[PDB]
Symmetry: D2
Subunit: 388 residues, 4 copies
């Protein structure tokens, strides 16, 4: 009937999301800045579980150690007052002009050293605040032109950076894991580690791969026209889905950061189905921007709608999977056979099995329908709640 979030639903929001002032490449801010304390409060009242932050969202850049301390304690007090948690944190290595060519892979060596020190400083803070995941979105790592960046050297520098962060964390005894967030472009012409697959592959080259996973974002993979639930299944299959950023995107264009549920709705349905089915237990984090058309009432409406749409899709996906008619259609489409080993009998028995080749009736096989269209219309009926 209705769909109210509880903190048990693990919904979390970045300070920068509801706090986005509405500045875009062609326009000035349309909303005033939000005090972090005020956001914690408002989010708590909406049913959220926690918030996340960039170092610079919380502690304004160039802050004295003194001012730093005051900012953290007011924040901490808001968290104690509301019961809100801080499950993830990250570093802003993209806004300040010093990062115009990147942080960890900037051509200037002194900038790469500064980016590491800025990062290390905020990992200590995140650990204090209790975060369990440290996200890294290398927004400025990339190029607008081919000669500007040797990508093998840049990958060496990127691995060097993450390996040093891993050494730091292990030597401190910290219980925190890293999650690399890929994005194919924007604000660089091309960004390094453009998709979930590139980040997964990169991780396997690190000195301690087990400390690193991915933080995929709905809109990022869709900016490359990729199927996000598929990319998430691959990350789940690799054991690397450490966090996830949820939002909406209408296709291949600039990253819109629409509220979750907006953009590609069927994709959202299949994503919720997979997360709930796979038992994903991390935060459901919304990395989104209330449109600049909105005032603050529209900001909290947008934030509420993220949660609402997740909870509606979860109910429709559970209804779909629990429907006996759907379970029969799944067997009719042979999903059960997909889950069985192709050749548990082993290579030699396969080579020896004439039914697998010499005597296989390929024409009868080809004639069998997969029945996928009836299955997909049942999924559609369930999503629309039209199961007459």
């Amino acid at each position: 009937m209705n769909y109210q979030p509880t903190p048990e639903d693990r919904f979390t929001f970045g300070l920068w999301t509801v706090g986005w002032q509405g500045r875009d490449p062609f326009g000035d801010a349309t909303r005033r800045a939000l005090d972090p304390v005020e956001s914690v409060r408002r989010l708590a009242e909406l049913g959220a579980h926690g918030v996340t932050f960039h170092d610079d969202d919380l502690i304004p850049f160039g802050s004295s150690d003194s001012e730093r301390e005051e900012h953290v304690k007011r924040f901490r007090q808001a968290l104690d007052d509301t019961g809100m948690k801080v499950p993830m944190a990250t570093t802003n290595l993209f806004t300040h002009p010093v990062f115009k060519d990147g942080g960890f892979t900037a051509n200037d060596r002194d900038v790469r050293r500064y980016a590491l020190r800025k990062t290390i400083r905020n990992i200590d803070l995140a650990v204090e605040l209790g975060a369990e995941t440290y996200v890294a979105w290398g927004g400025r790592e990339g190029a607008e032109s081919g000669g500007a960046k040797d990508v093998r050297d840049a990958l060496d520098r990127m691995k060097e950076a993450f390996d040093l962060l891993g050494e730091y964390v292990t030597s401190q005894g910290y219980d925190i894991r890293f999650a690399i967030e890929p994005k194919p472009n924007e604000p660089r012409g091309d960004i390094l580690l453009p998709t979930v697959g590139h980040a997964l592959a990169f991780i396997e080259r690190l000195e301690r791969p087990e400390l690193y996973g991915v933080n995929p974002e709905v809109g990022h993979e869709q900016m490359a026209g990729l199927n996000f639930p598929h990319g998430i299944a691959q990350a789940l299959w690799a054991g690397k889905l450490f966090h996830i950023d949820l939002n909406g995107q209408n296709g291949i264009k600039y990253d819109q950061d629409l509220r979750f549920g907006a953009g590609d709705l069927r994709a959202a349905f299949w994503l919720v189905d997979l997360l709930e089915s796979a038992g994903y237990s991390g935060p459901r984090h919304f990395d989104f921007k209330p449109p600049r058309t909105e005032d603050f009432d529209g900001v909290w409406a947008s934030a509420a709608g993220c949660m609402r749409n997740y909870l509606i899709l979860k109910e429709r996906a559970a209804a779909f999977r629990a429907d006996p008619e759907v379970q029969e259609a799944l067997r009719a489409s042979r999903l059960d056979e997909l889950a069985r080993p192709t050749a548990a009998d082993g290579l030699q028995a396969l080579l020896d099995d004439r039914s697998a080749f010499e005597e296989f009736d390929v024409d009868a096989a080809a004639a069998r329908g997969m029945a996928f269209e009836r299955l997909d219309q049942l999924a559609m009926d369930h999503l629309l709640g039209a199961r007459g």
Copy 2:
């Protein structure tokens, strides 16, 4: 002045490329079939090093063991007559209706067993013909709808298939490596292992990863709007570029398979620069389709142009890298600094280095220009041969 290929340039072509009859989703064949023997001949005269094949290009489907033998010997004779080599081969697991839901990840278990046997049969043949690389393009592995395919189960099946192929090859003592060819879509709505990064990550989960690399294709990565030279640098960095398919593509749309050099020309320039710089020593294979507007004279013209454009770009990229003014611009943009370790002095010295944070002049750093636009115009002048 001019640009004639020699077999030393390692240019190779699939039988299916120049042999494409011009059938597309809206139209009938516009050219008659080509005899493989005739293609070997014509390609040899154009300066090509070798050819490649799908099992079904060479031996028509459903061929008796008898007919099989005759097809192979005529082919072999053409190769002896011309000096042409066969460096790579692959399996057609996409054309026959039995593969409509996939080969290795078809939901029907008996189809997956047949796909493995069909593959194993052609690996023996490729080894006989001397191929060093066996390519696998899983064109039908994927879905048009979310419920049709559990992607974790499909990845299990895909790993199972490649692991069995690796066991086969090792138990036979064969000297051949596999190269997985990613593609994001077409002819399935979404294909599994959609990009070079997804294939790289997948490989690391196989039982013997060292037997497997990638075969990226220019147009495939551009169908996801990705930067192909970047994806190739990542594959080179991982030690996994085992083969490469060259062609041209105009952006995000159906896969056009234009001749190499057509489509995104600057991308082609940066790709040739990287392959020649990195010392890539594999075949330069053209996987392309002469447009259906063409007769056979236009087919060989198209094939010649692939080679011609590679050789022109190689000369311009070598001229660019050898130009002292470009080498100065590279230092001005700090490419040399990119190649130096960020922190060879180690974590503790970095943490102890006040010049990396406490005393770093971020405002002076931010003010330094990267000089990338002057570097890129030198690259452009060289490509256009306008170095006045």
Copy 3:
């Protein structure tokens, strides 16, 4: 509760849709051909209003005048037996190799003359069968390369063709209008008149513009990443929406021709809302392809689902527009003000109105929220039937 189509709903299907055999650029047919008579029958039983055809779907190419006549009479008999209508027809100017460079804008003048005669022949037939709309999809009008086609000369040839067709129709006294179907690419690299807007503009240059409108297709505009309901509003605004092709498409890639409702579901919702609101009274034609994974049972399931999804969306859009809370949100977002003239008082009164500039409070204006996010979540709740 449930959603059965009646012939009053004006649902129509091309013979080529349910009759698609499953041939794609990488694969053989997976279904046997369908007899047109059988399709008419099956569609009638599903609740369809009528069917459409290319000349070549009905009368196989190169048919004697004799065979032609027999094909038409069996068809006609099926229509009499079922009550099915034929509201639209079109010409196949894309499949035969003679059309490889186009029909009306082929470089060869004799091919352009043949394309006109082939077209004229089928207009007489369509008129006999009672069609009210003749569609023209110039699938082969275009180029893969810049020098192959002078586009100003091609536009001259295209206008020449349509002007001659208009002269023909007027001199025969026929009551039929033409509808130009744009598509941005596929099967040519770029097709002429790539979007609804280009076709609208072209029409205004014809000798009798009033005889011509557009036949936009859902998937075609989405292949250019465009908003289809917006393009349809522009066509409605121009008085030119003469027919519409419905299907589903997942973003910018090859044209998938998914059943209607699949692909971008929210877009489908906003399209149905606009058609029903604007009083569009033409056929709701499905130009789609049952996936090649399917057997014939899946074909009719796919066809039924097209109708079902339209009828479900129509109910949700009517519920949305009839909801008093939505009507209040529309006024809160000032949709009512959008419909009022900006300056009914005229230019001089506007120039004289100090409240429009000298004394306009721009800061108070900027501060007003548009309230669009709350409106969009009401639309979402209605679509999902979650109006608790």
Copy 4:
């Protein structure tokens, strides 16, 4: 050999291009603001013909009539000192928060009235400064969500606005024409009049269509994956190319505004070929952004490169068209036949011509090759200056 621009080449630049400070959606300004007077100067020294402006680039928003006057006279003095012209001007209706939902089609009626008054004020100024073209880019006219904007009502409002501007200009006796600049998205989710074709069609509905043309932009049409030279040929064919914005774009993604020549290089070649061939005589205006990686030396380098690349492409396109071998290839591909009327003999003679149908040899026609691949490689050789 080398390629120096002269003011006779009609190269022009917006104040906002070289003056872009480097603010993007994720980052702060990296360059200090430029004084307009300084830009005029620097551009003059580079060989530019003139500059253009938004009202707000020249006169800071909220300026007293007094300050206004001083800004204009310093500007005017710079123009007198350098000989620079001001051929085009436009209005900023996108930056100030008051325009967050649009200018001419904002839902708030008072905002639409203010947008017209702001525009009228700057047309008087542009006319004083001698501009011949007034550009209108409706950057904020559009929506992020379907219910936010009734597009038929918005088109009514947009027509109302342009009709009032036309009445104003005619009643003042001003010699100035308007040029509508389409863009498919960014910064709105979808923008109204998304492509050259939609703007062309819209214009035909205005009260005095002859006062309005288009200002297409390279990167804008490529953001929809469209062929820009094709769109320009259609605009030329309609007599509506009144101005053009040149830059570079790498495919379908955020609008990059790269210098001209960057992005799709072959497209740039075919565009220059068409403009020079068609005798386009308007300004060659660069609407581009020097990358934020650059300091001011890189800004002027980027600006110089725009001009340089145009002049190099113009030389290669003229060489291509003047090459007797290319003129023979054009006849071999039947470009000459494309330019001949299909049926100058008229409808009745066509219907009576048995050679056009009854006796047309379709099989011999189909067999003729179009020879486009050889033609395209000649175009490629010329572009690369490899005409051995």
